[PDB]
Design a protein around this ligand. Structure first.
Ligand code: CLA
Ligand code: CLA
Ligand code: CLA
Ligand code: CLA
Ligand code: CLA
Ligand code: CLA
Ligand code: CLA
Ligand code: CLA
Ligand SMILES: CCCCCCCCCCCCCCCC(=O)OC[C@H](COP(=O)(O)OC[C@@H](O)CO)OC(=O)CCCCCCCCCCCCCCC
Ligand SMILES: CC1=C(C/C=C(\C)CCC[C@H](C)CCC[C@H](C)CCCC(C)C)C(=O)c2ccccc2C1=O
Ligand code: SF4
Lengths: 73, 41, 165, 740, 41, 88, 98, 159
């Protein structure tokens, strides 16, 4: 999210990391998209654009949002 | 952790969490549900 | 020149499409002697292509950004501009025949229902009455209007099977 | 004992029963009160069992029905010969078969159809045909269009004779039931007479007509100066130079010196390199030996002169202790039930059509047929599907016999009764082998797809990775390749080039080349075995449970084709054997579609292609050994790598194949209404439409009704099968015409 | 003739006669006249 | 259940000895079909860690001889039991 | 039961319904005597279904937690190894994101 | 003398089986009656010990031979064995669940061996008896997995 904030037109959104133990060695390498280290999945949900539009910048704020929504749940 | 203090994720969090929720959690769900549906009276 | 569509007579893509079709049609012409019957069929096809391109132009037809002619559907706009031949007059042209079939089917249904075992008449057609009604259906809208006012066209729902909800 | 019992004039020749369309059934003889009367009229039209309970009238009806079908087929064949005589380029194709595509259908210039008259070569335009009639007319020696005209007129004359024969043998002189029950005479006359006489006549025609014409055709002689076959027939001098054994003149035949006939009755393995088809001398000796085998087999049964075999004695004498009564009553069933004989004949006809397709794709029996990839593919696929349809109909009519003509009085402990007794064991074991084959074929496919997707090709079931080598098929191939060396020393070469070591090619294109079998062929063959086991499970379960079942004990009294027994027992929908056949039609469709996909891909990737000086290049890149192990590989490299010519066929000679493809898509998709849905919703919608037509007094006298549940299932399966068949037909023909 | 023309009057023959008439009419219109798009006389 | 089912009688093992006498030492091509089978099992025993290959001729003789054997013992069993029961 | 033709008697209905053990014997302690108590003491601590369901779950959750945390990266499973340099850019039709 | 080999069981043509040479063969009947699952007088834990030993010895093979790490030498023989042990634990859990499910009631009708003489009750058909059987099954499976492991360590041939 920070890399998306710095460059939205270039850096792709990432949804979640992919920890599948049945993955092969080319499979781990071919899914480190978005300038990441581990195997990650590209986000197409649009929450990156929405959260950049509403002023969320740092992942600390997203952590606070997650814990607040867990509390309200 | 710095700037991540709510629900601190370790580096081994996926490698540990994925097999309980793909392995142990479905097994407990299966056993509990099977004891539920087969319960007499 | 409505909705940003140039006329077919002054469209570059229309003429480029015509040149492309003439090129591929003449490509097959080089594989046959001119005195052969496939050559005559290909020549007749090319003549039909040239006649179609000529007749589609200079008739008020228009096209836009594709070289393929477009049809104007709005009445009034197709009446103020010369575009009534596209869909406006075919609308009444189809409706006349569509009302022709509906009227002769109605008269045959009415005539057959006032007859013993009328279910047989649907699978055993009678030719002289059907052909007489076929040639007595030119004035279908005139028969349809007079039956509409007097209740012979319609039927009150007290003798109509209705759902029990 | 065997005689000709014929009743003269049983039915008057008049249009009295033509006046009333509903006359065969007493239920339909009243009138068309509902719209289901029409569908019952066209459905029970040829069902002769409920028309009358007399077997003699049914036998006469089916005899003249076969006469009418024979006349129809003769009319169709005469029309094909007339089309080849008038609208064809057969004269041009004879002088150049490797460069001029066959064409025998000419369209009209009425509405844009002039683009369908493709440039097939030879100064001719028309629809490029795929039936391979030109190859047949080159094998059976035919030079000019006059001969095709004569054949067409003779076929029309014989078709009129067959229709007159049906009219005579029903309305004028109808045989009695004892005439039809002469099974021994029937078998002797259709073994020695029909098959044997036809084989001997064809062998004589090949020897006296086709052999000199084909000997002069592949030698470079133009067909214009080739002598007509009557010159070869009458004059021994002209036939003596082409074949020196004709100078002997029937001396070695009666003096038992048949080794002198080794010039035109040869025993050669392989194909003629000039044409690509089988040697006509080999086919002549083949049909002569077949005529011998059918002449000797046609004198086996006893009819009127004491000697022979009685089929009842043969059946009742073969009794083995694990079977109790052994074939005890089957003679009584097969002499009294038309449907049992229909099931047997349809099953054997369908299987033999499957053998026909396989053995034409294996050994092409026609000149310039192997290089014509379209004709070979079309023949294989068409006879494939016709064989499947005949097998499914065999199952259907077996189930019909089970429902109607089966009685428990004659059979107590025979084979049929014991098959009824242990039907649950058969169905359970068939289900087990079904699940086993399905898992270790399709799960192997899914596992290969997953290991490809997971980036681990070394864990796949491929040749590069761990492999399942078909050792038995490859050993059979090696044995057949080495069969002429030891076990058949008089054969020149191998019986086919499936297992050979040489590649034949006519006109720069590969005619037939050796076929390599790997892991992918193993997977597809066991997929085929799985699919056929499922389809035979469905058909056999429908036949076995048609009479009675643990669910519905009184299914026999409910008829063969009934929709259901109601929503009782949780819902007994599709419980009839007719619905079992209805599902077996789709399973047949899946089986034969996968089979012909395997055929097309394997032959395009490992057999068909254009030969070069630097090796042999196939149509594809030889990717069957690398892409047929996965479902995505199958999809991308067969259905997507091909069909690029069908989509771009527009504006060309084969655009009608694209139109047919999309119409087939339409009909295949339109069928799923009649498959998913039911009747009550459609009946209520029809009620609303009936109210609409009632409001302004256009109410039909015949009440509009929704289609029956069996009627709806029949419409759905018919539209589905027609759409799928036309889809595969259009795709296969467009791909094989634009490329091959 | 009556017995045969009663069969001639049933629906399948009517399913041909209308079909042959309308089909041939449209063939002759599309044949003698070319393919048009506009009804501009 | 009358444990004589599939009756083990040593008389039908005698018919398994006639086929090596009939097929074997009966000239024809080479020496015999059973003689060729004997030569094939002779040379196959040399490569004990491996087995016969696809190009080997051993499988043809083995399969042909073994279906001939199975046919002759099946027919002998059928005949010798039809004689006893009354089936002939 | 089965005197001449009868298959039902209503006092030995265990025979009437067809409940028959086709393969059943009552021979006790076929294994040698010293062999049982080695395995009889093996089962007695896990004979209860509560002790067995717990033990399977005890070896279940612990070994599952052992995998990934310690089970992976010792077998060199290709999920905790990392890439060399693959798949930073994406898009063959241009744009070239990331 | 027809030799009617195919006959119903106990002369009863009303029930499911018919006595067939697949069933009525003395060798097959003796082999099936001597299998541990049909030794009714033996305790169910002693049944489960042999059954689990045989099944855990057989289940190790495919995991070692066709496992994901089969090409890695020295480690395939341990990964296959611990995966086989995990499969044995899964089967033991499902066996215990079946023992809970199918024996929450009490059977009332005996098995009736041929020509009578039935014992009171199979201990395998009980709740605690099937629990002991599953305990014997998991102990036997673990011991068989360990035995197939040590047989892959010491060897004169292959693995
Ligand atoms: C309900 C929405 C939701 C969904 C669909 C997912 C989905 C996922 N999470 Mg997440 N997670 C969630 C909520 C959710 N999570 C919340 C609210 C928390 C904070 C407690 C977490 C904490 C969390 C961690 C720490 C990890 C995952 C992981 C995962 C992945 C594997 C599943 C797993 O281990 O279960 C999640 C396991 C839990 C114990 C969370 C249960 C929380 C309950 C419902 C309260 C998967 C992509 C793992 C992974 O590989 O990352 C991709 C991993 O290591 N999740
Ligand atoms: C519901 C169907 C429908 C629709 C959507 C339209 C739509 C249109 N008509 Mg049309 N029209 C219709 C039926 C319809 N017509 C029928 C049935 C007739 C009688 C034959 C006409 C006769 C007609 C005439 C005579 C004219 C239009 C015009 C127009 C356009 C301007 C509308 C307007 O009020 O100016 C916008 C006003 C905003 C306040 C617009 C494209 C006019 C046109 O072509 O514009 C140049 C015009 O002169 N119409
Ligand atoms: C000439 C007879 C006739 C007449 C006057 C009508 C009139 C009507 N029908 Mg009906 N219809 C007919 C025959 C007829 N239908 C037949 C034969 C069928 C079966 C295919 C249907 C199936 C049908 C459905 C499924 C629906 C209608 C609907 C309608 C209404 C919409 C108008 C329309 O064009 O519908 C469209 C009609 C069709 C698409 C059917 C076309 C079939 C052909 C043209 C009819 C052939 C009749 C024949 C030539 C007459 C014999 C002539 C005589 C001299 C021998 C209207 C009340 C709709 C409704 O409820 O609207 C309120 C509706 O949903 N109809
Ligand atoms: C040797 C004598 C002989 C021959 C050649 C045939 C030939 C045939 N029979 Mg058979 N039949 C025979 C004796 C013979 N029959 C006897 C003795 C009986 C009484 C037991 C029957 C009873 C019988 C029945 C009940 C049926 C047949 C049918 C058929 C046809 C099957 C169609 C087919 O396979 O495609 C081959 C197709 C062709 C070869 C097309 C050419 C057909 C030609 C014109 C027939 C010429 C053969 C004929 C015997 C010549 C003498 C007839 C004379 C009075 C003109 C075939 C033509 C079926 C049928 O109805 O078809 C007629 C059928 O259902 N047969
Ligand atoms: C040797 C060939 C043969 C013979 C003699 C019979 C004879 C018979 N069968 Mg059998 N059958 C056969 C082959 C044969 N069948 C095959 C190959 C199949 C598999 C498809 C079946 C499946 C079958 C079933 C499932 C049933 C029968 C039934 C019947 C009986 C009446 C059939 C009838 O009235 O049809 C009437 C004729 C029609 C309905 C016309 C067929 C139209 C089809 C549905 C569509 C054809 C479309 C065409 C291929 C392409 C046109 C495209 C379109 C756009 C124009 C009769 C005993 C029925 C019965 O009651 O038996 C006693 C029955 O339930 N048969
Ligand atoms: C491609 C479509 C498709 C597929 C896959 C199936 C699948 C099935 N049908 Mg069906 N069928 C279909 C369409 C299809 N149907 C349609 C449209 C019809 C209407 C005509 C029918 C008519 C029909 C009949 C009449 C019969 C079947 C039967 C079957 C079974 C065959 C099982 C077998 O041997 O294969 C093996 C199993 C499969 C191919 C299923 C997929 C297995 C994959 C590879 C997964 C492997 C294991 C996996 C890892 C487990 C996942 C674990 C997870 C839960 C965590 C199966 C349940 C038959 C039956 O009951 O069995 C004898 C039967 O009699 N079907
Ligand atoms: C429902 C949609 C629809 C419509 C509006 C049309 C209308 C038209 N199409 Mg299309 N067409 C359709 C469906 C349709 N068709 C379908 C389903 C097919 C596939 C079978 C075709 C295939 C097709 C082709 C291949 C061609 C046409 C052509 C035509 C024209 C011929 C009209 C005619 O017969 O002369 C007018 C007829 C009369 C005036 C009848 C007179 C009746 C009395 C006497 C008055 C017309 C513009 C042709 C054309 O002109 O191209 C533009 C042409 O080449 N169409
Ligand atoms: C890792 C799992 C595990 C655990 C927690 C135990 C734990 C126990 N077992 Mg056990 N055992 C194991 C594996 C295990 N064993 C294995 C693999 C075998 C070989 C089949 C045995 C064979 C065995 C026997 C034969 C006996 C025990 C007994 C015992 C108890 C005393 C310890 C002893 O003498 O060991 C050994 C204790 C409850 C003894 C017991 O409970 O005595 C009352 C006893 O009789 N066990
Ligand atoms: C795979 C399917 C295996 C079916 C096995 C039973 C076949 C049916 C069966 O029991 O048939 C019994 C049959 C011998 O019985 P009989 O000799 O008394 O029967 C012969 C007369 O029906 C003639 O044996 C075989 O067919 C052996 C080969 C089986 C393969
Ligand atoms: C659609 C549908 C119907 C409704 C379909 C009906 C009533 C059949 C309609 C047949 C029509 C009337 C045949 C003729 C079609 C056209 C009128 C032909 C046009 C030809 C042109 C030249 C005009 C069912 O009755 C049904 C029953 C059971 C399962 C599924 C279904 C089902 O899916
Ligand atoms: S849904 Fe139809 S086929 Fe099924 S039980 Fe009901 S009425 Fe019968």
């Amino acid at each position: 999210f920070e890399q998306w904030v710095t460059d939205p037109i270039h850096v792709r959104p990432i949804a979640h990391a992919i920890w599948d133990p049945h993955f092969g060695q080319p499979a781990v390498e071919a899914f480190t998209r978005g300038g990441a280290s581990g195997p990650v999945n590209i986000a197409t949900s649009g929450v990156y654009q929405w959260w950049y539009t509403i002023g969320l910048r740092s992942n600390q704020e997203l952590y606070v949002s997650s814990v607040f929504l867990a509390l309200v749940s | 952790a710095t700037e991540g203090y709510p629900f601190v994720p370790p580096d081994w969090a996926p490698a540990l969490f994925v097999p309980l929720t793909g392995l142990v959690l479905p097994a407990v769900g299966m056993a509990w549900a099977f004891t539920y549906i087969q319960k007499e009276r | 020149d409505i909705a940003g569509l140039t006329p077919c007579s002054e469209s570059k893509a229309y003429n480029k499409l015509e040149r492309k079709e003439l090129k591929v049609l003449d490509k097959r012409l080089k594989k046959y002697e001119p005195g052969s019957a496939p050559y005559l069929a290909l020549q007749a096809t090319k003549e039909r292509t040239e006649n179609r391109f000529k007749t589609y132009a200079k008739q008020g037809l228009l096209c836009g950004n594709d070289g393929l002619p477009h049809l104007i559907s709005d009445p009034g706009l197709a009446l103020r501009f010369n575009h009534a031949g596209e869909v406006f007059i075919p609308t009444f042209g189809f409706l006349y025949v569509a009302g022709y079939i509906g009227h002769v089917g109605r008269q045959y249904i009415i005539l057959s229902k006032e007859d013993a075992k009328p279910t047989d008449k649907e699978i055993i057609l009678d030719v002289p009455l059907a052909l007489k009604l076929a040639f007595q259906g030119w004035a279908w809208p005139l028969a349809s209007i007079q039956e509409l006012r007097n209740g012979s066209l319609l039927e009150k729902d007290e003798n109509i099977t209705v759902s029990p909800r | 004992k065997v005689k000709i019992a014929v009743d003269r004039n049983p039915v008057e020749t008049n249009f009295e029963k033509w006046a009333k369309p509903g006359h065969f059934s007493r239920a339909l003889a009243k009138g068309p009160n509902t719209t289901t009367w029409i569908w019952n009229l066209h459905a029970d039209a040829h069902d002769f069992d409920n028309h009358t309970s007399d077997l003699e009238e049914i036998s006469r009806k089916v005899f003249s029905a076969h006469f009418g079908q024979l006349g129809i087929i003769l009319i169709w064949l005469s029309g094909m010969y007339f089309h080849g005589a008038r609208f064809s380029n057969y004269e041009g194709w004879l002088s150049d078969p490797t460069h001029i595509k066959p064409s025998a259908q000419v369209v009209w210039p009425i509405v844009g159809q002039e683009i369908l008259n493709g440039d097939v070569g030879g100064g001719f335009q028309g629809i490029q045909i795929t039936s391979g009639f030109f190859q047949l007319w080159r094998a059976s020696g035919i030079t000019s269009e006059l001969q095709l005209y004569s054949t067409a007129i003779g076929g029309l004359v014989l078709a009129a004779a067959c229709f007159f024969a049906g009219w005579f043998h029903y309305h004028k002189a109808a045989p009695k039931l004892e005439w039809f029950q002469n099974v021994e005479s029937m078998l002797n006359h259709h073994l020695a007479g029909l098959l044997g006489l036809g084989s001997l006549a064809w062998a004589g025609h090949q020897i006296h007509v086709s052999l000199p014409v084909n000997k002069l055709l592949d030698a470079g002689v133009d067909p214009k100066e080739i002598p007509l076959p009557h010159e070869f027939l009458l004059n021994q001098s002209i036939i003596a130079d082409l074949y020196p054994s004709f100078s002997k003149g029937l001396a070695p035949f009666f003096t038992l010196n048949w080794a002198e006939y080794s010039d035109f009755l040869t025993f050669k393995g392989g194909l003629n390199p000039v044409t690509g088809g089988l040697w006509l001398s080999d086919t002549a000796h083949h049909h002569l030996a077949i005529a011998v085998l059918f002449l000797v087999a046609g004198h086996q049964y006893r009819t009127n002169w004491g000697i022979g075999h009685s089929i009842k004695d043969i059946l009742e004498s073969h009794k083995g202790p694990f079977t109790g009564n052994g074939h005890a009553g089957l003679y009584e069933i097969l002499t009294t039930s038309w449907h049992a004989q229909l099931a047997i004949n349809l099953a054997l006809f369908g299987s033999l059509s499957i053998i026909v397709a396989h053995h034409m794709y294996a050994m092409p029996p026609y000149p310039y047929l192997a290089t014509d990839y379209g004709t070979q593919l079309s023949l294989f696929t068409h006879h494939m599907w016709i064989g499947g349809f005949c097998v499914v109909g065999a199952g259907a009519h077996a189930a019909i016999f089970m429902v109607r003509d089966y009685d428990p009085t004659n059979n107590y402990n025979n084979l049929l009764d014991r098959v009824i007794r242990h039907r649950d064991a058969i169905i359970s074991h068939l289900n087990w082998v079904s699940i086993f084959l399905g898992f270790h074929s399709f799960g192997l496919y899914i596992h290969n797809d997953t290991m490809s997707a997971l980036g681990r090709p070394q864990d796949m079931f491929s040749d590069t990775a761990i492999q399942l080598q078909p050792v038995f098929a490859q050993w059979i191939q090696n044995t057949h390749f080495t069969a002429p060396q030891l076990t058949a020393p008089n054969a020149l070469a191998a019986t086919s080039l499936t297992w050979g070591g040489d590649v034949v090619a006519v006109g720069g294109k590969v005619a037939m080349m050796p076929i390599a079998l790997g892991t992918s062929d193993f997977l597809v063959h066991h997929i085929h075995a799985f699919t056929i086991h499922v389809t035979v499970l469905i058909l056999l379960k429908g036949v076995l449970f048609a009479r009675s079942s643990r669910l519905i004990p009184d299914k026999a009294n409910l008829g063969f084709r009934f929709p259901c027994d109601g929503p009782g027992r949780g819902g007994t929908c599709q419980v009839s054997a007719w619905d079992h056949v209805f599902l077996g039609l789709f399973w047949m469709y899946n089986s034969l579609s996968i089979v012909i996909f395997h055929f097309s891909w394997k032959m395009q990737s490992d057999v068909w292609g254009t030969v070069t000086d630097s090796g042999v290049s196939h149509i594809t890149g030889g990717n069957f050994a690398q892409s047929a192990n996965t479902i995505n590989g199958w999809l991308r490299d067969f259905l997507w790598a091909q069909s690029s010519q069908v989509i771009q066929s527009y504006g060309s000679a084969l655009s009608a194949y694209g139109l047919m493809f999309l119409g087939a898509h339409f009909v295949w998709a339109f069928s799923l209404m009649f498959l998913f849905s039911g009747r009550g919703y459609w009946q209520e919608l029809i009620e609303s439409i009936v109210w609409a037509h009632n409001k302004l007094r256009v109410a039909p006298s015949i009440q509009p009704r929704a289609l029956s549940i069996t009627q709806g299932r029949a419409v759905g399966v018919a539209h589905y099968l027609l759409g799928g068949i036309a889809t595969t037909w259009s795709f296969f023909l467009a791909r094989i015409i634009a490329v091959g | 003739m009556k017995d045969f023309t009663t069969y001639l009057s049933t629906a399948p023959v009517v399913g041909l006669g209308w079909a042959i008439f309308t089909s041939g009419l449209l063939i002759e219109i599309n044949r003698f006249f070319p393919d048009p798009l506009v009804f501009s006389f | 259940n009358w444990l004589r089912v599939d009756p083990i009688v040593p008389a039908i093992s005698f018919v398994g000895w006639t086929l090596p006498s009939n097929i074997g030492t009966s000239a024809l091509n080479g020496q015999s079909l059973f003689g060729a089978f004997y030569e094939s099992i002779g040379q196959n025993l040399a490569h004990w860690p491996t087995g016969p290959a696809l190009d080997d001729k051993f499988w043809l003789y083995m399969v042909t001889w073994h279906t001939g054997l199975f046919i002759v013992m099946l027919l002998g069993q059928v005949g010798v039991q039809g004689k006893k029961q009354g089936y002939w | 039961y089965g005197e001449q033709s009868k298959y039902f008697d209503l006092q030995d209905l265990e025979n009437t319904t067809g409940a028959w053990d086709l393969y059943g014997v009552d021979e006790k302690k076929r294994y040698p005597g010293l062999q049982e108590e080695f395995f009889q003491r093996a089962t007695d601590a896990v004979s209860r279904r509560e002790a067995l369901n717990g033990f399977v779950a005890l070896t279940g959750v612990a070994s599952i937690a052992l995998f990934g945390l310690k089970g992976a990266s010792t077998l060199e499973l290709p999920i905790t190894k990392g890439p060399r340099m693959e798949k930073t850019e994406n898009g063959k039709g241009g744009i070239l994101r990331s | 003398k027809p030799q009617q080999v195919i006959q119903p069981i106990n002369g009863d043509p009303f029930v499911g089986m018919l006595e067939t040479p697949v069933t009525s063969a003395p060798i097959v009947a003796n082999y099936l009656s001597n299998l541990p699952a049909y030794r009714t007088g033996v305790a169910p834990n002693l049944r489960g010990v042999e059954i689990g030993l045989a099944h855990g010895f057989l289940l190790a093979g495919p995991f070692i031979k066709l496992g994901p790490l089969r090409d890695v030498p020295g480690t395939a023989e341990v990964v296959g064995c611990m995966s086989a042990a995990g499969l044995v634990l899964i089967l033991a859990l499902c066996l215990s669940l079946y023992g809970n499910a199918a024996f929450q009631n009490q059977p009332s009708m005996g098995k009736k061996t041929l020509s009578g003489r039935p014992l009171p009750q199979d201990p395998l058909m009980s709740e605690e008896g099937w629990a002991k059987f599953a305990a014997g099954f998991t102990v036997g499976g673990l011991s068989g997995v360990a035995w197939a492991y040590i047989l892959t360590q010491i060897l004169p041939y292959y693995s």
